[PDB]
Amino acid sequence: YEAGVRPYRETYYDPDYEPKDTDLLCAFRITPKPGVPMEEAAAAVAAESSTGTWTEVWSNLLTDLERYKARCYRIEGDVAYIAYPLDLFEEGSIVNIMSSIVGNVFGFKAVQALRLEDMRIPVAYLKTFPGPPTGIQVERDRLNKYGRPLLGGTIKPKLGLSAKNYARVVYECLRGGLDTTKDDENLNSQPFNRWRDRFLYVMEAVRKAEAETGERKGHWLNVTAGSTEEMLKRAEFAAELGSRYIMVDFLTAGFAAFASVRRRAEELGLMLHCHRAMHAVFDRQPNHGIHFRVLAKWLRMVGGDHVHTGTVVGKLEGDRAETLGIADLLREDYVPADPGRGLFFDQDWAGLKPVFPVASGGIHVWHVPDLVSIFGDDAFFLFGGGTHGHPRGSRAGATANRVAVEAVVQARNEGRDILAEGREILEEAARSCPELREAMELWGDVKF
Amino acid sequence: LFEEGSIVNIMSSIVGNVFGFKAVQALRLEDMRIPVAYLKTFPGPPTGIQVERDRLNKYGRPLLGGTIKPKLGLSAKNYARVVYECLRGGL
Amino acid sequence: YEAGVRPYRETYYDPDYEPKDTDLLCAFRITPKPGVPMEEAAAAVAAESSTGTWTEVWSNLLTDLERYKARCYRIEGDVAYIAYPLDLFEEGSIVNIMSSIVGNVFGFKAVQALRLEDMRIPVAYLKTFPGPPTGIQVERDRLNKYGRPLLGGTIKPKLGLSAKNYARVVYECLRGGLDTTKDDENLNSQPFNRWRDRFLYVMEAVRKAEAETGERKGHWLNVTAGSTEEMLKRAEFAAELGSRYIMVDFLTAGFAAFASVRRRAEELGLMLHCHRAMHAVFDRQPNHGIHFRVLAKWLRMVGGDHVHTGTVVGKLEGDRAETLGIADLLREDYVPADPGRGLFFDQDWAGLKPVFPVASGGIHVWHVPDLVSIFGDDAFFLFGGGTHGHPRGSRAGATANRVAVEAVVQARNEGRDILAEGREILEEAARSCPELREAMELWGDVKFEV
Amino acid sequence: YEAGVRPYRETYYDPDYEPKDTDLLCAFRITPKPGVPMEEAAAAVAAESSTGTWTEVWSNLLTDLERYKARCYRIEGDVAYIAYPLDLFEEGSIVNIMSSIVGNVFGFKAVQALRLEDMRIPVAYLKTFPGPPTGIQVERDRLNKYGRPLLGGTIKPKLGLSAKNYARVVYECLRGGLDTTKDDENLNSQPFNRWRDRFLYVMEAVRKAEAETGERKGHWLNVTAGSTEEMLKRAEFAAELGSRYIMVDFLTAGFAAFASVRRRAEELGLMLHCHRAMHAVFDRQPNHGIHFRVLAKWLRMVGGDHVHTGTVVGKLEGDRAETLGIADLLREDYVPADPGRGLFFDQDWAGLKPVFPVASGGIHVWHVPDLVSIFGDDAFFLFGGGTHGHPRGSRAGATANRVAVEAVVQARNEGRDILAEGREILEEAARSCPELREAMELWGDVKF
Ligand SMILES: O=C(O)[C@@](O)(COP(=O)(O)O)[C@H](O)[C@H](O)COP(=O)(O)O
Ligand SMILES: O=C(O)[C@@](O)(COP(=O)(O)O)[C@H](O)[C@H](O)COP(=O)(O)O
Ligand SMILES: O=C(O)[C@@](O)(COP(=O)(O)O)[C@H](O)[C@H](O)COP(=O)(O)O
Ligand SMILES: [Mg+2]
Ligand SMILES: [Mg+2]
Ligand SMILES: [Mg+2]
C-alpha cells in the first residue's frame, strides 16, 4: 500500500485491453479542462464510474481491482471507449446502470464537458430484462390494423378543457379516422380536469366512436402522477374501464416507477405508451449530456410498447440519420454499428420484443410523404394541431390525415417514388377528399 | 395548472418539451418561485435538521461522514470492516 | 418570565394588525358577562382558541408566540374580528378547525353568549382539501338533465314502512316525474325496515321507473350508521347494486367519518348527498352558535355533492337574503363580501367543484315561483308531503310538482316576471295538467310566515 | 285516505299514554311561536322526530302508525314528555338517536326555541351498546393508584411548542408529581409540531419520569384527525410505542368515528380519554340546545374511559347541582330522578362500566378543597396553567398541586371539614412545602 495521489491513467487507461462479449461498453465524447491530457480525462471517467476515487486507499488490497475495474481501452480523437465488467451491475436495473455510468462523472473539474453517445448492452445482461410486454406484432393483432402507419394525435389545448369537452374532442378525432388519441404529457389530475372524470368520459367517447366507425380505437390515458402508488391506482382504473392503453412519462416519473408500472401494465392486459418528456434537457446539445439513442435502449429494456422518436421535419429538433438509427434500435433484432447514423456498437437484442416508433410535433399533411419515406409502415404518426387546427375542426382534420397516409402508402406499394411525386400523390387524393384539399391549403406555407 | 403534491407534474410542464424546439437553440431553467398555496400540498422532510441532531445527540459542529472505498468490489465482510474502522476512528 | 394572571387584552388584542392573505379570519358576535369589556372578551376568545390560557406560563419563552398567536384586530359594536396564522391548522382537517375555533371558547364564564357568523378560509389552506367528488356539472351529465331545477322528495311516513311498501312509494314518485327520491334522515337500519332489504327493493323500483319513463333516475340511500366501518360497508353494497347515489347525515355522523365516506364514494363512483340533520341545534339562535354559512363552507371543503340549504318559505326557518349568500358560497368560484346577506369576508374557492343547494321542507306547488326566483336552475326542490299528500297519491303529486317547475322555468325564459305572474303561470299550466289543478286546490290556503 | 293538512295534536298528543319500560323517553323544554298552543308545539316535535310530516299522506295506510309513532304523553308548564317505541331505533347507534331526536325538530317556525333536557335510555336498548372498555376500577389497577383523585394537566402554550420542548414540559410535570399530562384539544398535527415527532418525544419523557419517581405515569396523546383512518393510524402508533392512553375529541371528530376509535382502542389495550370540545356550542343556553347530561349518557354508552365534566369553580361555566348529577350518571349503576339536579328520569345502566369524571379549566391550589368535596376520589383534576404558571416552573407547580390534593384527602380521612378548614389545611401543608406556599401566594386573589 503506497498512499498518495496518482494519475488516473496509471490504473484506468489500458489500450491493450480486448473487450469481452460480456462487458458493457460506453462511448464518451470528452472535452477536457485545458491542460488535462485526453488520456487522463478518459481514465478519470472510467475510474470514478467503477472502482476508483481521487487518492489511493488501503482497502484496495482487500479486493481484486483487476477483476472489477472499468478500463478506457481506446481513444479516437475526443471519443473514449470504456469497458465495464459484467459483475459491476445489478441484474435487471436500469437505475443501477445510470448510477455508475452517469452518476458523478459529468461534474468533475478535470472534464469540462462530457456526452455519452452510445452503449453496448451485452447479451448476458440483456437476459435479465423483460423488454416490452406487447410489441409491434401483437399490437397490430389487438388493433386489427396492418400494412400502414397508425394514426394518432394529442388533444389540444394542452390544459384547460373540462372532462366533458375534452372527451368531445376525442370522439370527433376518432370518429373522423384517427386510430388513437392521447392526453398531453402534462395533463395528469388538475382542478379543471380530474383524472377519474377524464377516464370515464373518454372511454365512453372511445366506445361510441368504435361502434359508429366499425374500427377498433384507443386512447392513451396518462397515469403519470407524483408517486408510484398513485400511478398504479390510475392504471388499475383504466383497465377496469376497458381501456386498451395507458401512457406514462417515463423520464419525469423516473425509471424505478416506470418499471413498476410496466410490470402492472402486463398483469392488467394494458399496452403501454411512453412519452419522453424532459429528454431534451440532456440530449439536445452535442457537447454535454446523454444522446437519446441511449435512452431508447434503456426504454426497450424495461419495456415500453411505444416511445416518441421525433419527426425530423416537425417543430422539434431531430437529425435524419440519427433518427433512422434510433428506429432500427427500437424495431430490429440486431443492429450493426454505423458511424453514418451515430451507432458506435453492434447491438444484439437477445430476442426482446420490438417497440413502435412514434413521430409527433408540428406535422401536417404535407409531411406525410417524408414521414412514410423515413419510417415505413411500423410507426405512429401523431397530428395534434394538425387535426384540431383544420378549418372545419377535428373530425375533418382526422379524415384529411388518414386519407393522406393511405394515399402515400398505396403509392409506395405500387412502386412510385413517393418523395419525387409527393405533391402529385396528395393532389390526386384531394380530388376525392374535400377535407384533405382544405388542409393542404391552410398549411401550404408552414415550414420548419 | 398544477397537480397538488406532484413534483412529477411540475417537471412535465416546465421542462417537458420546451427544451427541444428548433426555434430555441438552448434553454436553461435558472430558478422557480414555488407559491405558498402550492407548497402546502407537499410534506417536506420527514426528520429535519433539529430532530436529527436530537436523534444523533450531536450539537455545535458539522457532522463527519465518508464513502466506503473502493466504490465496488469489496465483499460484504470486508466492506463492514472498513465501516467499523472509520466509525471507531471518529466519523 | 413574570408569573401571575394578566388580562387577555394585553397580548391578544392588536387593533393595528393587518390581516395576511394566508390568515384564517373569523367574525364573532360576543355577549360579554356584564362588567367585562368587549375588548377583554374578544381577546379571551382569541387567546383560548389559539395559544393562551388563564395565567402566564414559563413555557411561553420556549416558543415564538408572536408568530403563532391569534389576534383580535377590529371591534365594531358586538362584532369581533380575529385572525389566525395559517400554521396553526392541520392540513385538510375540518375537525382541527372546529377544535380550535369552537373548541372551548363558547363555555367561558366571562363570555355569556358567542356566535360565529362567518369565516375567511385562505387559498393556501383550501388547497389542502379535495372538495366535492362529483360537482354540479358532472352530475348533470351523469343524469342527462339540463336547464331546470331537479325534482326530489322524501319518502313518507318517515318510519314504519316495510322495505317492500317503501319501494312501492319510490316507484310511484319516480314514475310520476320526480328525478330522485330519498330515505329520511332518521331511517338507517331498523327492525321494521333493514338496510339490506331496503337497498335491494328500492334499486329494483328505480330500474323499473327508468325503463318505463325513459329518463335516468336515482334514489338517495341513507348509509348513516353508528360507526364508520358500518357506513362504508353500506356504501359498498349500494355501489354493488348500481346506485348512482348514497346519502349521509354529515353532522350527526360527524366530520371525521364524513371525510371517510366522501373518500370511499369517489373510489366507488358514487354521488354523495349530504343531510344537515342537527344543524338547527346550534345555527338557529342569533346570540349563540354557528351560522349555517360557516357549516356550508366546511361542507364544500370536505366535499359533498349536495347540501340542504332551507326553503325560506317552507315549514323550517330560513332568511331569504342569507340563503342567497349561502347559495353563492356553494356554487360560485368567488364570492365577494356583502353586508346585506351577512357575508363578512370575500371567499375565494381556489378551483374547488361546486355543490348543489337542496330546498326541502313543507313546500308545495304554490311555492314554486318563489323557489325558482331564489335558487335559479342549479338546485334540487324536494316535495315529500307535497307529493304523497296529493289527493290522488304519489304518482299524481310527482307529476304536479314536475309540471309546475317546468312551467315556471318556461315563463321565466320567456321573459315573464314569475313572482308578479306566479299564480297566472300556475293556473295556465293547470288547464292542461289535472294533477296540478288539484294540488293547487288542496294546499292553496296552507302558508308559512316568512 | 283524507287528503289535506291536519293539526299535529290530533295524532301525536296522547295525555292518556302510559310509558313502557322499553320506550325511550325525552324531556323537552319548548318555547312555541306566539299563538301556537303548547300541545300543538309538543305534538309537532313528536311527529317530526318519528313518523309524521306536514300533511296527510296516502302511505300512512300502508303502515301501523299506532305501533310506531312517538307520543307526547305529559306536559308540565313548558316541559313536554315524549315517548318513542323501542323499534324506532337502530341497535347500538348513537348516530341514529341523534338523527331522530335532534335531527330537524329544532328548526321549525312553529317552535321558536327548543332544549332537550334529559333522556331515559331503556334497558332493552342499552344492551346493544358496549360501554367503556376499561372503567374506573380496571384503570386504577393498571395505574396502581388508589385512595385519592388523580392528577393531570394540559401542556401550555396550547400551540407553538416544538416536539422537543413539548416533551420537556411533560417531563417536568410528571417528574414533579402529576400522574398524567395531555395534548391540548386543538393540538393534532401541525407544521410546528407533527404528531409522529410528538408521540416519540413524549413517550421517552414518560418512561424517564416513570423511572426516576418509581410511580406509573401516562400521557394522553391526541389522535384527533380529519378522517377515521388517520385517527386509527395514530392510535396504532401510540400503542406500538407502549402508551397507556390515547385521547379523542369525540364531538368534533363525531360519534361515528368515535365508535370506530373506541373499538380499536380496546383491541389495542389502550385507555381512552374523551375531550368534549364543541359541547358548549349546543349545551350552554337554557332556552335552546342539548343539555350536557344527554351527551354524557351517550358518551358512556359508546364507551369513553374518561370525559370532562367541568369544575364549577373554574374559568368555564358549570352548575354545582347539575354537575353532581352528571357524575352519578357517569359512575353509578343506577341513578334515580332528582328535580334538584335536573335529572328528569331514573336511569338504569344495565351493568355497563363507569366513566372517570375529569375536572379541568382555570383551577389552582385554592380550589382543591371544593374539587375533592364535589367529586370525591374517583376523578381527575387537571392543572394546566395552574402547573406551568408556578413562579418556579412546571416541576415546582406539579409538586404544589400533588401536595395540596394529598393534604386535603388526608384531612378528610381524619374527619376534618375540608371546606370550613380548607385554608387552614393548605396553610399547614405549605409550612413544609415551599412550592405550595408560593402557589397560594401567587393566585390567592384569582377567583371566578
Ligand atoms: O406536447 C406536444 O407538443 C405534443 O403533444 C405535440 O402536439 P402537436 O401534435 O400539436 O404538435 C407532443 O407531446 C410532442 O410532439 C412531443 O414531442 P416528442 O415527440 O419529440 O417527444
Ligand atoms: O324530514 C323532513 O322533514 C324532510 O324529509 C322534509 O319532509 P317534507 O318534504 O314532507 O316536508 C327533510 O329532511 C327536511 O326538509 C330537512 O330539513 P332542511 O332541509 O331544512 O335541513
Ligand atoms: O384548553 C383548555 O382550556 C384546557 O386545556 C384547560 O387548560 P388550563 O388547565 O390551563 O385551564 C382544557 O381543554 C379545558 O379545561 C377544557 O374545558 P372542559 O374541561 O370544560 O371541557
Ligand atoms: Mg404533448
Ligand atoms: Mg327528512
Ligand atoms: Mg385544552
CSV table of N, CA and C and ligand atoms in Angstrom, one decimal, chain C residues 48 52-55 57 103-104 107-108, chain D residues 153-156 158 182-186 247 275-277 279 307-311 315-317 358-363 382-388, ligand 3:
chain,number,residue,atom,x,y,z
C,48,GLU,N,-57.9,31.8,24.0
C,48,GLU,CA,-58.2,30.4,24.3
C,48,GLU,C,-58.6,29.5,23.1
C,52,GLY,N,-53.2,30.7,24.3
C,52,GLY,CA,-53.2,31.2,25.6
C,52,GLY,C,-54.0,30.4,26.6
C,53,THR,N,-53.8,30.6,27.9
C,53,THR,CA,-54.6,30.1,28.9
C,53,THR,C,-54.8,31.2,30.0
C,54,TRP,N,-55.3,30.9,31.2
C,54,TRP,CA,-55.8,31.8,32.1
C,54,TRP,C,-54.7,32.5,33.0
C,55,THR,N,-53.4,32.0,32.8
C,55,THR,CA,-52.3,32.6,33.6
C,55,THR,C,-51.0,32.5,32.8
C,57,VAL,N,-47.3,31.4,31.8
C,57,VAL,CA,-46.6,30.1,32.0
C,57,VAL,C,-45.2,30.3,31.5
C,103,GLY,N,-63.8,25.1,20.0
C,103,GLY,CA,-63.5,24.1,20.9
C,103,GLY,C,-64.0,24.4,22.3
C,104,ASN,N,-63.4,25.4,23.0
C,104,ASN,CA,-63.7,25.7,24.4
C,104,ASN,C,-64.3,27.1,24.5
C,107,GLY,N,-67.9,28.3,26.2
C,107,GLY,CA,-68.3,27.9,27.5
C,107,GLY,C,-67.6,28.7,28.6
C,108,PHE,N,-67.0,29.9,28.3
C,108,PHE,CA,-66.4,30.7,29.3
C,108,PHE,C,-67.3,31.5,30.1
D,153,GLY,N,-52.9,17.4,33.7
D,153,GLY,CA,-52.7,18.8,33.3
D,153,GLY,C,-52.4,19.0,31.8
D,154,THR,N,-53.0,20.0,31.2
D,154,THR,CA,-52.7,20.3,29.8
D,154,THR,C,-51.4,21.0,29.6
D,155,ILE,N,-50.6,20.6,28.6
D,155,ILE,CA,-49.4,21.3,28.3
D,155,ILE,C,-49.7,22.6,27.7
D,156,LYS,N,-49.0,23.7,28.1
D,156,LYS,CA,-49.2,25.0,27.6
D,156,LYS,C,-47.8,25.6,27.2
D,158,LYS,N,-50.9,26.4,24.3
D,158,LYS,CA,-51.7,25.4,23.6
D,158,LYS,C,-51.0,24.9,22.4
D,182,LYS,N,-51.5,15.9,29.2
D,182,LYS,CA,-52.3,15.7,27.9
D,182,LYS,C,-52.0,16.8,26.9
D,183,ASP,N,-52.2,16.4,25.6
D,183,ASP,CA,-52.2,17.3,24.5
D,183,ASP,C,-53.4,18.2,24.6
D,184,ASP,N,-53.3,19.5,24.2
D,184,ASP,CA,-54.5,20.3,24.1
D,184,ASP,C,-55.4,19.8,23.0
D,185,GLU,N,-56.7,20.1,23.2
D,185,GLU,CA,-57.7,19.5,22.3
D,185,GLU,C,-57.5,19.9,20.8
D,186,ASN,N,-56.8,21.0,20.6
D,186,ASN,CA,-56.6,21.5,19.2
D,186,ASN,C,-55.1,21.3,18.8
D,247,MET,N,-56.3,9.9,23.3
D,247,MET,CA,-57.2,11.0,23.5
D,247,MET,C,-57.9,11.3,22.2
D,275,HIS,N,-62.3,14.2,25.2
D,275,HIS,CA,-62.4,15.6,25.4
D,275,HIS,C,-63.7,16.1,24.7
D,276,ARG,N,-64.4,17.0,25.4
D,276,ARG,CA,-65.7,17.4,24.9
D,276,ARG,C,-65.7,18.7,24.2
D,277,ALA,N,-64.6,19.0,23.4
D,277,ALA,CA,-64.6,20.2,22.6
D,277,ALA,C,-65.8,20.3,21.8
D,279,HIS,N,-68.8,21.2,23.0
D,279,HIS,CA,-70.0,20.9,23.7
D,279,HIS,C,-70.8,22.2,24.0
D,307,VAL,N,-64.3,11.5,30.7
D,307,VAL,CA,-64.9,12.6,29.9
D,307,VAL,C,-64.8,13.8,30.9
D,308,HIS,N,-64.6,15.0,30.3
D,308,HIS,CA,-64.6,16.2,31.1
D,308,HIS,C,-66.0,16.6,31.5
D,309,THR,N,-66.1,17.0,32.8
D,309,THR,CA,-67.4,17.4,33.3
D,309,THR,C,-67.5,18.8,33.8
D,310,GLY,N,-66.5,19.6,33.7
D,310,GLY,CA,-66.5,20.9,34.3
D,310,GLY,C,-65.9,20.9,35.7
D,311,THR,N,-65.6,22.1,36.2
D,311,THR,CA,-65.1,22.3,37.5
D,311,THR,C,-66.0,23.0,38.5
D,315,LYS,N,-62.7,28.5,35.3
D,315,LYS,CA,-63.0,29.6,34.3
D,315,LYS,C,-64.1,29.3,33.4
D,316,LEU,N,-64.6,28.0,33.3
D,316,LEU,CA,-65.7,27.7,32.4
D,316,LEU,C,-67.0,27.4,33.2
D,317,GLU,N,-68.1,27.6,32.6
D,317,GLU,CA,-69.4,27.6,33.3
D,317,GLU,C,-69.8,26.1,33.7
D,358,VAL,N,-63.6,14.2,34.8
D,358,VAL,CA,-62.4,14.9,34.7
D,358,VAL,C,-62.7,16.4,34.8
D,359,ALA,N,-62.2,17.0,35.9
D,359,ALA,CA,-62.4,18.5,36.2
D,359,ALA,C,-61.2,19.2,35.7
D,360,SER,N,-61.4,20.3,34.9
D,360,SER,CA,-60.3,21.0,34.3
D,360,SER,C,-60.8,22.3,33.8
D,361,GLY,N,-59.9,23.3,33.9
D,361,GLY,CA,-60.2,24.7,33.4
D,361,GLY,C,-60.1,25.8,34.4
D,362,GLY,N,-58.9,26.4,34.5
D,362,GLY,CA,-58.7,27.6,35.3
D,362,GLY,C,-58.8,27.3,36.8
D,363,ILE,N,-58.3,26.1,37.3
D,363,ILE,CA,-58.2,25.8,38.7
D,363,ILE,C,-56.8,25.8,39.2
D,382,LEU,N,-57.2,18.4,36.6
D,382,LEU,CA,-56.2,18.8,35.7
D,382,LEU,C,-55.8,20.2,35.9
D,383,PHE,N,-54.5,20.5,36.0
D,383,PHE,CA,-53.9,21.8,36.3
D,383,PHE,C,-53.0,22.1,35.1
D,384,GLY,N,-53.4,22.9,34.2
D,384,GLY,CA,-52.6,23.3,33.1
D,384,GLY,C,-51.8,24.6,33.5
D,385,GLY,N,-52.5,25.7,33.3
D,385,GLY,CA,-51.9,27.0,33.8
D,385,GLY,C,-51.5,26.9,35.3
D,386,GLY,N,-52.3,26.2,36.1
D,386,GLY,CA,-52.1,26.0,37.5
D,386,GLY,C,-50.8,25.2,37.8
D,387,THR,N,-50.2,24.6,36.8
D,387,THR,CA,-48.9,24.0,37.0
D,387,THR,C,-47.7,24.7,36.3
D,388,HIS,N,-47.8,25.1,35.0
D,388,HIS,CA,-46.7,25.7,34.4
D,388,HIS,C,-46.6,27.2,34.8
E,3,LIG,O1,-57.8,24.2,26.7
E,3,LIG,C1,-58.1,24.4,27.9
E,3,LIG,O2,-58.5,25.5,28.4
E,3,LIG,C2,-57.7,23.2,28.8
E,3,LIG,O3,-56.6,22.6,28.4
E,3,LIG,C3,-57.6,23.8,30.3
E,3,LIG,O4,-56.3,24.4,30.3
E,3,LIG,P1,-55.9,25.1,31.9
E,3,LIG,O5,-55.7,23.9,32.7
E,3,LIG,O6,-54.7,26.0,31.6
E,3,LIG,O7,-57.1,25.9,32.3
E,3,LIG,C4,-58.9,22.2,28.8
E,3,LIG,O8,-59.1,21.8,27.5
E,3,LIG,C5,-60.2,22.8,29.4
E,3,LIG,O9,-60.3,22.8,30.8
E,3,LIG,C6,-61.4,22.0,28.8
E,3,LIG,O10,-62.6,22.6,29.3
E,3,LIG,P2,-63.8,21.5,29.8
E,3,LIG,O11,-62.9,20.7,30.8
E,3,LIG,O12,-64.9,22.3,30.5
E,3,LIG,O13,-64.2,20.7,28.6
